[PDB]
CSV table of C-alpha atoms and ligand atoms in Angstrom, one decimal:
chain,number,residue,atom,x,y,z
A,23,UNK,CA,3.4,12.7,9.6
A,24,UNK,CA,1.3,10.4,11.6
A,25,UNK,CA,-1.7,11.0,13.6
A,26,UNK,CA,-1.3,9.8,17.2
A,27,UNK,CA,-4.7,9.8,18.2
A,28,UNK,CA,-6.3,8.4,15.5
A,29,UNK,CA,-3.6,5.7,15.9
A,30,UNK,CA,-4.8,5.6,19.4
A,31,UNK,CA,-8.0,5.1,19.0
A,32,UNK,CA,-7.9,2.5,15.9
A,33,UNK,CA,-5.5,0.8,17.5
A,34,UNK,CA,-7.6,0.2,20.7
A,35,UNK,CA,-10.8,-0.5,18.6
A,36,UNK,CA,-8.9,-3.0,16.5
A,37,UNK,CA,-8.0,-4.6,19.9
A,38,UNK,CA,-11.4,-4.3,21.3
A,39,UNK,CA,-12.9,-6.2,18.4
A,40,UNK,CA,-10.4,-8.7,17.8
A,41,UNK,CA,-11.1,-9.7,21.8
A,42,UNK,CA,-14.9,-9.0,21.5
A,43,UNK,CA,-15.0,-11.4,18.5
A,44,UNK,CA,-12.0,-13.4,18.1
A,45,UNK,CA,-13.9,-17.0,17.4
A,46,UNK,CA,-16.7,-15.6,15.7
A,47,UNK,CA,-14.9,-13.0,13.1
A,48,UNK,CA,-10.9,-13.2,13.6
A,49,UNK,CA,-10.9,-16.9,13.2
A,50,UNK,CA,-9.4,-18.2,17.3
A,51,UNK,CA,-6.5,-16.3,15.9
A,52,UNK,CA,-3.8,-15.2,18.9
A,53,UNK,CA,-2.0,-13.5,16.2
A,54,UNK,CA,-3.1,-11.3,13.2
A,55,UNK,CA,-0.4,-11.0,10.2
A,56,UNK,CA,-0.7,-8.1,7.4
A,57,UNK,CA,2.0,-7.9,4.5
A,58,UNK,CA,1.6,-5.5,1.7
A,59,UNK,CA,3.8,-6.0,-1.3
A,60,UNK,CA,6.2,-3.3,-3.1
A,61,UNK,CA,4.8,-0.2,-4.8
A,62,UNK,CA,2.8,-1.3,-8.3
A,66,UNK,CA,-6.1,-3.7,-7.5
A,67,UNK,CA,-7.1,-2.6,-3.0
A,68,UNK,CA,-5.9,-4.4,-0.4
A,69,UNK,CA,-7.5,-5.2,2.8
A,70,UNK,CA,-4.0,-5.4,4.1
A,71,UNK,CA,-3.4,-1.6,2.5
A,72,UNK,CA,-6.6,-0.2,3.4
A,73,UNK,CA,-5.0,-1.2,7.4
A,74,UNK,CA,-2.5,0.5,7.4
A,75,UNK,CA,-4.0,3.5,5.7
A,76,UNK,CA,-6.4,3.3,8.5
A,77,UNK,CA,-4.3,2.6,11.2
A,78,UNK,CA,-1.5,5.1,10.4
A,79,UNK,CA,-2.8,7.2,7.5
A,80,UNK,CA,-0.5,6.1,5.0
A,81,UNK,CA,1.3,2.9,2.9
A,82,UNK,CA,3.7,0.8,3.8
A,83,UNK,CA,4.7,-1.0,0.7
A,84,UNK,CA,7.0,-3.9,1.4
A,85,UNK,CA,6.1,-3.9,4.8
A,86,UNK,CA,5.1,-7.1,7.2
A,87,UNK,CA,3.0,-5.9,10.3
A,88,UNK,CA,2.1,-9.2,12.9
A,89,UNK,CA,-0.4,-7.8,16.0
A,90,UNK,CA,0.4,-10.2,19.1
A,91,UNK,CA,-1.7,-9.8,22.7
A,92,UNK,CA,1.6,-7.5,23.8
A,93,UNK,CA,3.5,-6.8,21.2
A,94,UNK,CA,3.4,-5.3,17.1
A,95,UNK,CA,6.6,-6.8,15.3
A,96,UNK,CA,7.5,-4.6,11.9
A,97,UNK,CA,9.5,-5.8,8.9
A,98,UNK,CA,10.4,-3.1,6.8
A,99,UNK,CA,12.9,-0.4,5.5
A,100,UNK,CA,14.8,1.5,8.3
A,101,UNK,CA,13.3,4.5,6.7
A,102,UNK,CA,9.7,3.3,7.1
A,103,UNK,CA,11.8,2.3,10.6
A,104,UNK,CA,12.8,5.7,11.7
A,105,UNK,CA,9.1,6.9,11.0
A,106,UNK,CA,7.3,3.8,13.0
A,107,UNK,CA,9.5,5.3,16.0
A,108,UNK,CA,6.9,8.4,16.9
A,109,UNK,CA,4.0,5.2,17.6
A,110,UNK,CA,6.1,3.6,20.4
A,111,UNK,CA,4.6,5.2,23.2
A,112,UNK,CA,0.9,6.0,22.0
A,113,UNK,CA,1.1,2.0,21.1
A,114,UNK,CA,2.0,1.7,24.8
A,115,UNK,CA,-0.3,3.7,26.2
A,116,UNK,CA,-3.5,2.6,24.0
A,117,UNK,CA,-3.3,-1.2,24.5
A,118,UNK,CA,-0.3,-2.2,26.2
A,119,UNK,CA,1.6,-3.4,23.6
A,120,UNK,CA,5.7,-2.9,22.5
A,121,UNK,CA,6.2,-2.1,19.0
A,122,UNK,CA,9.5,-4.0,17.9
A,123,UNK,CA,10.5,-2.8,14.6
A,124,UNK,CA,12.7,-5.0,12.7
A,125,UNK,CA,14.8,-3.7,9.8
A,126,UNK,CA,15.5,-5.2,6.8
A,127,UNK,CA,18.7,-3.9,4.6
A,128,UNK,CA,17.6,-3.4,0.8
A,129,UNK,CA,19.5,-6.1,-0.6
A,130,UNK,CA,18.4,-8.4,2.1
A,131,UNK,CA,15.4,-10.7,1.8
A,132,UNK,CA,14.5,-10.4,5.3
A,133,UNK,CA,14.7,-14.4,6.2
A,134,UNK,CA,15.9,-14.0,9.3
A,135,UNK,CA,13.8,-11.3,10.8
A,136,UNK,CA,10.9,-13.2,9.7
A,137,UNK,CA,12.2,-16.2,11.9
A,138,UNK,CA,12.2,-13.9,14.8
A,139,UNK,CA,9.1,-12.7,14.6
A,140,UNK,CA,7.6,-16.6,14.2
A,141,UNK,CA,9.6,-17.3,17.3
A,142,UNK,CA,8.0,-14.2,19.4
A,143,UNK,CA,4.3,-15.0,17.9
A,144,UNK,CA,5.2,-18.7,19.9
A,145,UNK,CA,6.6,-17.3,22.8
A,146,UNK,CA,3.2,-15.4,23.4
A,147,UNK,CA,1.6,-18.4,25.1
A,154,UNK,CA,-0.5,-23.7,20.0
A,155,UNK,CA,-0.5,-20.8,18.3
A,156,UNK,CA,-3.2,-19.5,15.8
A,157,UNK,CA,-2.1,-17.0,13.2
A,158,UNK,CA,-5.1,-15.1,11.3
A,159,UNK,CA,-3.9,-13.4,8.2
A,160,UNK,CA,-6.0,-12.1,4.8
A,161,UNK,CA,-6.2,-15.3,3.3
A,162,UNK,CA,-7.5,-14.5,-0.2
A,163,UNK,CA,-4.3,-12.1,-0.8
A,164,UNK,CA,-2.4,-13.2,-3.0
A,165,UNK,CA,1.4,-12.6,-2.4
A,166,UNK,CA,3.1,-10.4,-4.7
A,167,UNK,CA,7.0,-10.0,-4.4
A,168,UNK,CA,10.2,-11.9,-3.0
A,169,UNK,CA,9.1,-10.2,0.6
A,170,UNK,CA,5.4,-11.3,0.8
A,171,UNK,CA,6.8,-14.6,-0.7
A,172,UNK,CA,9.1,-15.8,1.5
A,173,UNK,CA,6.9,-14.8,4.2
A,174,UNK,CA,4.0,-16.8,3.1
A,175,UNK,CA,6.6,-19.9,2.6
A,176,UNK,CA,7.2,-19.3,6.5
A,177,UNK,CA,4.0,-19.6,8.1
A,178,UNK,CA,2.9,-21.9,6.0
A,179,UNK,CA,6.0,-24.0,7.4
A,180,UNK,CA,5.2,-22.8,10.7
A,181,UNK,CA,3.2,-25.1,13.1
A,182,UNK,CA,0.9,-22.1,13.3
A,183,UNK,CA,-3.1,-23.1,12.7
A,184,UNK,CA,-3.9,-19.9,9.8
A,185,UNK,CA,-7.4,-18.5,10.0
A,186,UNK,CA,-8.8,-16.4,7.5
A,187,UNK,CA,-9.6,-12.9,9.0
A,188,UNK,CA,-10.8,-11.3,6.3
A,189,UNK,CA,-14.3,-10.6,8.0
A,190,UNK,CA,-13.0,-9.4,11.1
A,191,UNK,CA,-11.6,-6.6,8.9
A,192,UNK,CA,-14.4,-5.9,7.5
A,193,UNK,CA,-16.6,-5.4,10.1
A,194,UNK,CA,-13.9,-3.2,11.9
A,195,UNK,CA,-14.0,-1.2,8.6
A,196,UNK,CA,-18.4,-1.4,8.2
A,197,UNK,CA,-18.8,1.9,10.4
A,198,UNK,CA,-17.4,5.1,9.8
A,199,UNK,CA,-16.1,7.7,11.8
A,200,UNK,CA,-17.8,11.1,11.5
A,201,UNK,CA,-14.2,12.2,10.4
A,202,UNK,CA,-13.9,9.1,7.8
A,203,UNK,CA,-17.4,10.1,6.6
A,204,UNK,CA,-16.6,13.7,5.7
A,205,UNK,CA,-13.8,12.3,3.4
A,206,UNK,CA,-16.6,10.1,1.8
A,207,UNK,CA,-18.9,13.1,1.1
A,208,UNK,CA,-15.9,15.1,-0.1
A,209,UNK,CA,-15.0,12.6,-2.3
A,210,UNK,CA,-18.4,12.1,-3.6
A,211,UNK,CA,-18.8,15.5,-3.9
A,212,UNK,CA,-16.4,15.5,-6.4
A,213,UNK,CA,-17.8,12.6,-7.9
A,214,UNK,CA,-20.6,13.6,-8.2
A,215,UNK,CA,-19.3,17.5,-9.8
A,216,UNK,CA,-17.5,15.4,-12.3
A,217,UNK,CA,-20.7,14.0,-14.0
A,218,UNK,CA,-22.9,16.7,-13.3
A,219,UNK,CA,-20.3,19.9,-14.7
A,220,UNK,CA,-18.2,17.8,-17.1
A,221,UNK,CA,-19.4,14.1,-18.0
A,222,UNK,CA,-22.9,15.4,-19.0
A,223,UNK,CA,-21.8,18.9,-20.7
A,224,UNK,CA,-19.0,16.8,-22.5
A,225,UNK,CA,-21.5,14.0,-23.7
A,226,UNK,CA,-23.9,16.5,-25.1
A,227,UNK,CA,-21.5,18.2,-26.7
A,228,UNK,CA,-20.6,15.4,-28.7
A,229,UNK,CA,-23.4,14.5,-29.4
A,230,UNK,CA,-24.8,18.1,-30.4
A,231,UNK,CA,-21.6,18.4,-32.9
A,232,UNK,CA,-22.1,15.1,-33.9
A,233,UNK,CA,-17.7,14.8,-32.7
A,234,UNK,CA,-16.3,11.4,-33.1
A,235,UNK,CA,-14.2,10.7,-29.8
A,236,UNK,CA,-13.1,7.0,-28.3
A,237,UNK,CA,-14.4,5.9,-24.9
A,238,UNK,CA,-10.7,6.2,-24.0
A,239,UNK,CA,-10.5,9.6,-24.5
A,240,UNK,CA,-13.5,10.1,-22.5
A,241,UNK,CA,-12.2,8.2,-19.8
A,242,UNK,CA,-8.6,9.8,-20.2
A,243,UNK,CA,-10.8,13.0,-20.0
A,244,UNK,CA,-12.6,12.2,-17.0
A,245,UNK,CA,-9.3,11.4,-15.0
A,246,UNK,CA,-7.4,14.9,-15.6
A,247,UNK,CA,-11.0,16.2,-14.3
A,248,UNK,CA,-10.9,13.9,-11.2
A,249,UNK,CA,-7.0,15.1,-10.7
A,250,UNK,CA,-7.7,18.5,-11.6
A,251,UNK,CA,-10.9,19.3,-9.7
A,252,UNK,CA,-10.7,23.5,-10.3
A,253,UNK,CA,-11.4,21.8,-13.8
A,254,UNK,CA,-15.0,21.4,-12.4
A,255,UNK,CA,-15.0,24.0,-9.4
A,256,UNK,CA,-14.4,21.9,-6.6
A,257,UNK,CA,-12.0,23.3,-4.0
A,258,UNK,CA,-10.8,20.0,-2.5
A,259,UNK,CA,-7.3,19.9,-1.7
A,260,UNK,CA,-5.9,18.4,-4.8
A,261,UNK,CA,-3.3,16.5,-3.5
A,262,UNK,CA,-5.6,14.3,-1.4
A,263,UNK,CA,-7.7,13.5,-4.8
A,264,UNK,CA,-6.9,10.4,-6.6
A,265,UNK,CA,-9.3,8.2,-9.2
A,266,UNK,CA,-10.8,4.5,-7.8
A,267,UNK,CA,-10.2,3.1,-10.9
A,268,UNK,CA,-10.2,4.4,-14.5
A,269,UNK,CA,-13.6,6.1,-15.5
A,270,UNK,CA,-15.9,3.9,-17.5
A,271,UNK,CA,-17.1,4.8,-20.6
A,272,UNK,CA,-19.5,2.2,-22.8
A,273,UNK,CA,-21.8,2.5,-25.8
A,274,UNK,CA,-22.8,0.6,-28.8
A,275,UNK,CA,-23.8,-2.7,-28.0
A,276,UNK,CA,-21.0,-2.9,-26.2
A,277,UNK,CA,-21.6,-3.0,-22.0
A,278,UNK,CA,-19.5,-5.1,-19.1
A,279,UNK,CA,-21.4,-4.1,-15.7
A,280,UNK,CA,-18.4,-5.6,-14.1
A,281,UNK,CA,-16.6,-3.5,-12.0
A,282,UNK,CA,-13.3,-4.1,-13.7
A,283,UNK,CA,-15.0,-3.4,-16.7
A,284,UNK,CA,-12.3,-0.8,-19.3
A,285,UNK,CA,-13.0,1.4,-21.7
A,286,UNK,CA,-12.1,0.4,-24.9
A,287,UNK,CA,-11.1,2.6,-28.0
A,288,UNK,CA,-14.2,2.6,-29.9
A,289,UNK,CA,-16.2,5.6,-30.5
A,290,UNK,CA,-19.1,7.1,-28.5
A,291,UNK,CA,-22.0,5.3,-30.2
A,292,UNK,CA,-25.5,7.5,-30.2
A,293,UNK,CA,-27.6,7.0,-33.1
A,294,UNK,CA,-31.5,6.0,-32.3
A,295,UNK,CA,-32.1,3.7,-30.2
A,296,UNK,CA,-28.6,4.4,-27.9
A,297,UNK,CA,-27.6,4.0,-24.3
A,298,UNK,CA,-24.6,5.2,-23.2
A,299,UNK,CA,-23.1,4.2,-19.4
A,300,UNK,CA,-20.6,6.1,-17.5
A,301,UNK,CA,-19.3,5.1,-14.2
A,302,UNK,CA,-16.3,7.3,-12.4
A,303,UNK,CA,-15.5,7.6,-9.2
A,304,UNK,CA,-13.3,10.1,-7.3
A,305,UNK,CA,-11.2,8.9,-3.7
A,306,UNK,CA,-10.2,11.3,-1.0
A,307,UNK,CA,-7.9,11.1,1.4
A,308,UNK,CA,-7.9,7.6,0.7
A,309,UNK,CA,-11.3,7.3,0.8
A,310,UNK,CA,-13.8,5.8,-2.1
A,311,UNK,CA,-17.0,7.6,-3.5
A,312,UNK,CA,-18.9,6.2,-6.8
A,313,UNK,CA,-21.2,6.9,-9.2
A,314,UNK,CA,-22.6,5.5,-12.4
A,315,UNK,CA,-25.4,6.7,-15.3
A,316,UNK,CA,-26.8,5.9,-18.4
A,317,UNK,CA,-28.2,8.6,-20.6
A,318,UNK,CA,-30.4,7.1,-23.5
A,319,UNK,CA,-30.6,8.3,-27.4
A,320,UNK,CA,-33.8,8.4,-29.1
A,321,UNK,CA,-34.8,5.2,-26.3
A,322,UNK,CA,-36.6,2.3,-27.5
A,323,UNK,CA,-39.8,1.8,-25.8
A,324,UNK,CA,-38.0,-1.4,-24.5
A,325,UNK,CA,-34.9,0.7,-23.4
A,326,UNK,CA,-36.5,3.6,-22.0
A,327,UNK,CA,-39.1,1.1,-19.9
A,328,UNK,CA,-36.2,-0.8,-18.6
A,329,UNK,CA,-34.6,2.4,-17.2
A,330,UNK,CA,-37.5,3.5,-15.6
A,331,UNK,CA,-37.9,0.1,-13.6
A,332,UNK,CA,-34.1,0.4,-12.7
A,333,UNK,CA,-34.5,3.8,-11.3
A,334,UNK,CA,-37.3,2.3,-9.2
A,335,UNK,CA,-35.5,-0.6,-8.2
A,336,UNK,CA,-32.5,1.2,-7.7
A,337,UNK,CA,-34.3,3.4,-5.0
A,338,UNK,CA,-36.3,0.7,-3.6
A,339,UNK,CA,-32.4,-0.5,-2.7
A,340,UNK,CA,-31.9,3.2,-1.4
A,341,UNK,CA,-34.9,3.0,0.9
A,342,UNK,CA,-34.5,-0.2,2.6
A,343,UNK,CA,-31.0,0.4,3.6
A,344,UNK,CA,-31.9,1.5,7.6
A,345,UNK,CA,-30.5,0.8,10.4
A,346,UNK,CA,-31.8,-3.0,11.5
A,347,UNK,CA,-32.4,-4.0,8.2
A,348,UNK,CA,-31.0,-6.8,6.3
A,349,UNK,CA,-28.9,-6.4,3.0
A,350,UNK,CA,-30.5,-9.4,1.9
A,351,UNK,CA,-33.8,-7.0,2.6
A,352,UNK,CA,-32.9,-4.1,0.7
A,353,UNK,CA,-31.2,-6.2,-2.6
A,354,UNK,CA,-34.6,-8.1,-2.6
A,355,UNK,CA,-36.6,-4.7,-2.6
A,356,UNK,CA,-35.0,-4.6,-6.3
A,357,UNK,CA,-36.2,-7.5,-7.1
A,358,UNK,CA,-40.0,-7.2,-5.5
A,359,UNK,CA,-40.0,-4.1,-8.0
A,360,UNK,CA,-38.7,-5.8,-11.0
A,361,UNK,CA,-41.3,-8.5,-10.5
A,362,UNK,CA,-44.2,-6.7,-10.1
A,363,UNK,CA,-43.3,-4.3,-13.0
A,364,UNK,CA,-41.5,-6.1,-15.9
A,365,UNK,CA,-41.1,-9.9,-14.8
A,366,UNK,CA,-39.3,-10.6,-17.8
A,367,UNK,CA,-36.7,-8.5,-16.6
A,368,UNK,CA,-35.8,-10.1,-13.8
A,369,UNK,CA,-33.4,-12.5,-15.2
A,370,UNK,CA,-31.5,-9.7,-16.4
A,371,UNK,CA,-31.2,-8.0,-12.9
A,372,UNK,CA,-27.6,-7.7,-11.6
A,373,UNK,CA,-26.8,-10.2,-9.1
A,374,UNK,CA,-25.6,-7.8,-6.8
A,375,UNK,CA,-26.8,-4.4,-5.5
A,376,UNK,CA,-23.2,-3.1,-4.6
A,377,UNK,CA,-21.2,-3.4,-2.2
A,378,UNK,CA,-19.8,-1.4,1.0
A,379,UNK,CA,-17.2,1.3,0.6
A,380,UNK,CA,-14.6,3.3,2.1
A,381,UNK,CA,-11.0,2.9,1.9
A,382,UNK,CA,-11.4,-0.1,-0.4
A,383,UNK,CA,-13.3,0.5,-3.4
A,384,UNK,CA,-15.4,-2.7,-3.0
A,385,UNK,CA,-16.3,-3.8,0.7
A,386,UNK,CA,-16.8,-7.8,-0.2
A,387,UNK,CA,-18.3,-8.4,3.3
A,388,UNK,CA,-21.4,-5.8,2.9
A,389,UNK,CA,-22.2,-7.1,-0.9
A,390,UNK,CA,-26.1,-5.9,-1.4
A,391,UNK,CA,-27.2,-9.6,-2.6
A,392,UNK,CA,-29.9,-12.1,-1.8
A,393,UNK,CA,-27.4,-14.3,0.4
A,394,UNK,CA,-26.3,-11.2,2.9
A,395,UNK,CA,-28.5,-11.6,6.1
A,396,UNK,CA,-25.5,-8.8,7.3
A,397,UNK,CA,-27.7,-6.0,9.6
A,398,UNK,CA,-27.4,-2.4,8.3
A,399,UNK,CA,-25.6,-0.3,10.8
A,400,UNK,CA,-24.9,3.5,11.2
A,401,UNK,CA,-22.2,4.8,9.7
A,402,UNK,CA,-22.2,2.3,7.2
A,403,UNK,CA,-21.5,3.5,3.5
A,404,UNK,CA,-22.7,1.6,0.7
A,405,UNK,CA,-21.7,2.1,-3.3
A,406,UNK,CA,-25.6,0.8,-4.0
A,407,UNK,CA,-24.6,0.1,-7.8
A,408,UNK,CA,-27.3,-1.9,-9.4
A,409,UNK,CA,-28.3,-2.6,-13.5
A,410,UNK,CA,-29.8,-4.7,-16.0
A,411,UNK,CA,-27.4,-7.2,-18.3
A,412,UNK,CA,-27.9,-8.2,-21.9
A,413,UNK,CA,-31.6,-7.1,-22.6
A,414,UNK,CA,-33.0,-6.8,-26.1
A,415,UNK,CA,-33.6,-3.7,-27.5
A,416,UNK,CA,-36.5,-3.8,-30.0
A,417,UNK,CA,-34.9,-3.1,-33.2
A,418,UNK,CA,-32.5,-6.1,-33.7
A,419,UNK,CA,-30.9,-5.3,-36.1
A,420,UNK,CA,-29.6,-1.9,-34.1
A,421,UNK,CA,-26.2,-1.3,-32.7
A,422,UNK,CA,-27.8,-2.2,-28.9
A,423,UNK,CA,-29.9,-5.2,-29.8
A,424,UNK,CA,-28.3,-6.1,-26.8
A,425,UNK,CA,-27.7,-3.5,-24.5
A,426,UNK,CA,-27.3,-3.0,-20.8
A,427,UNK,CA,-28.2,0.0,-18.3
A,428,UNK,CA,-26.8,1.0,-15.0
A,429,UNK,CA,-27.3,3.1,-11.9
A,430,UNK,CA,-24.7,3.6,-9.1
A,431,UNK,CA,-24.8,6.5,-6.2
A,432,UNK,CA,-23.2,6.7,-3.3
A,433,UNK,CA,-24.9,6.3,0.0
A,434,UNK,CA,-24.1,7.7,4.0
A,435,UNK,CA,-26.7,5.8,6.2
A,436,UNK,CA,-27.3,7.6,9.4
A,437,UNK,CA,-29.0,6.9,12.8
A,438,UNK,CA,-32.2,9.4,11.7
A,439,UNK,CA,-32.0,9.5,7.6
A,440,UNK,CA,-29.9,7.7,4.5
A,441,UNK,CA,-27.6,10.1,2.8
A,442,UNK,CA,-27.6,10.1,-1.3
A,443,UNK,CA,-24.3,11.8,-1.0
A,444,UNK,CA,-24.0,11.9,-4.9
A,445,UNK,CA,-27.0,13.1,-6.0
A,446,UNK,CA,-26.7,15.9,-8.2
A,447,UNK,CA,-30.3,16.6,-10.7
A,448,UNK,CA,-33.4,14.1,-11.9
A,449,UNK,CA,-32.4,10.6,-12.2
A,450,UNK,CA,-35.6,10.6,-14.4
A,451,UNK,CA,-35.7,9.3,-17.7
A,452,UNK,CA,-36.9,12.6,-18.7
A,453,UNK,CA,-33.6,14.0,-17.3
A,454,UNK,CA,-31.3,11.8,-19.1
A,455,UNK,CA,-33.0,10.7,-22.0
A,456,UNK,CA,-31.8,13.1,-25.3
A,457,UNK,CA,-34.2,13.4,-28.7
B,1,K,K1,-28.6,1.1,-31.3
B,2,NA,NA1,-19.6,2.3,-29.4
């Protein structure tokens, strides 16, 4: 089941930073508290256990002390935690003490014990993943008992994320598998399935596109992919929108109204594929009979889009690259500059959305190698030039999937012409 070495090593580099950085990025904190609630949105707290073991533990408390890693979970989960013991040991010098807690119990006074060892190692400062929210009697309680505790909590949230910033060469093969996928998916069935539509002039709900899209994803023979299917899950429900009708927010769902491509259309389709637990994205918009207003908006996207693309180095600022957008907005249609997402993307890997490497004007955060970056950018509620058309307003939006390397940045999803030309239809 579990993968000693890369336990090992993650272990040992989660150590390293925490002592490297522990005022600057993991709050003072002596102790570091993850909980991850009963099976049902990412989690920071999932994505660490996925990256320190390779799998979930739902229901599950895990507190990191100088010398020891306490465990609150099922004696199943238990049983498996054994095989770590020693390579916990013999990485960092810590005892893993697994606590089990009985179904039917609510694990009060295991949680006391662990408090008590967290104070024995020695005030005490406990850094935990503030902006969780606790889901569950489990996480609950917990929550209820350090904040009783005399502990000082420190948010640790960034300490994460920087441990998570640079991939692995292994972690960055499952990226380009993943947005391989993605990217296969859009190229060999989005755009085919589109045109179709279009071509036989088929009524069909964004629903059923997205619906679609998943059994693809799942499915990937569907599209000629030969990944190992059961590592292949969705990152969220594919994102179908047309007819005056756009949400560039990643939450954004697709609703049950049909595909809308009369003159003067844009259509935007987002999807992205995860393997082995790791996030890949992509996002288009195809135009239908384009406006003059429409199809010049696209073109200064694409532009800014890759300006984005291109300043992402090694050394460089995200602040940098997001502003690269906006030097090419500016300079090419200044009255669409208001209407310029906010955000440029965001890191990715495990979780969907890194929030600590978010591509905006406020992120003085240096690019690094082996960073990945979902560089998703668009344009909000512009006017199209017939008014009185479906998209008077309308919105337009480009997302690829990015690898940046010491020597060259990867466009890991490209698959044909971003050019109007390429996705505009007559
Ligand atoms: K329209
Ligand atoms: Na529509």
């Amino acid at each position: 089941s579990i993968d000693l070495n890369t336990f090992q090593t993650r272990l040992k580099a989660f150590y390293s930073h925490w002592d490297d950085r522990r005022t600057d990025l993991w709050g003072s904190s002596d102790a570091i508290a993850v909980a991850c609630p009963p099976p049902s949105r990412y989690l920071k707290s999932t994505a660490l256990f996925l990256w320190l073991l390779g799998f979930e533990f739902p229901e599950t408390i895990m507190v990191f002390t100088k010398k020891q890693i306490h465990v609150l979970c099922s004696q199943k989960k238990a049983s498996i935690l054994e095989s770590v013991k020693k390579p916990a040991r013999e990485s960092v010098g810590v005892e893993i003490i697994l606590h089990v807690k009985p179904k039917n119990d609510d694990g009060a006074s295991s949680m006391d014990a662990i408090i008590r060892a967290i104070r024995a190692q020695s005030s005490s400062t406990v850094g935990h993943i503030a902006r969780e929210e606790p889901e569950g009697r489990l996480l609950d309680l917990w929550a209820e008992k350090l904040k009783n505790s005399k502990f000082r909590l420190s948010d640790v949230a960034n300490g994460f994320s920087a441990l998570f910033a640079a991939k692995s060469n292994e972690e960055i093969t499952y990226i380009k598998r993943a947005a391989y996928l993605t990217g296969s998916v859009m190229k060999n069935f989005v755009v085919t399935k589109l045109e179709n539509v279009i071509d036989e002039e088929k009524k069909i709900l964004h629903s059923t596109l997205m619906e679609e899209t998943e059994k693809v994803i799942l499915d990937p023979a569907k599209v000629n992919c030969k990944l190992k299917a059961d590592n292949v899950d969705i990152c969220y429900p594919p994102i179908f929108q047309s007819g005056g009708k756009f949400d560039l927010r990643p939450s954004a769902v697709s609703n049950d109204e049909a595909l809308y491509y009369d003159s003067a259309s844009v259509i935007i389709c987002a999807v992205g594929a995860r393997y082995k637990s790791y996030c890949s994205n992509i996002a288009r918009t195809f135009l239908i009979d384009a406006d003059p207003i429409q199809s010049k908006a696209y073109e200064v996207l694409l532009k800014a889009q890759e300006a984005v693309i291109g300043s992402l180095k090694p050394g460089n600022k995200l602040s940098a690259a997001y502003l690269a957008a906006v030097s090419v907005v500016e300079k090419d249609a200044p009255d669409m500059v208001s209407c310029l997402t906010k955000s440029a993307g965001t890191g990715i890997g495990i979780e969907f959305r890194e929030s600590g490497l978010n591509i905006n004007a406020k992120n003085d955060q240096i690019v690094k190698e082996g960073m990945v970056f979902n560089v998703s950018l668009g344009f909000q509620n512009l006017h199209c030039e017939n008014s009185k058309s479906k998209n008077k307003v309308f919105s337009l939006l480009l997302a690829d999937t990015i690898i940046i390397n010491k020597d060259k940045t990867d466009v890991v999803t490209s698959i044909g012409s971003k050019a109007l030309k390429d996705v505009a239809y007559s």
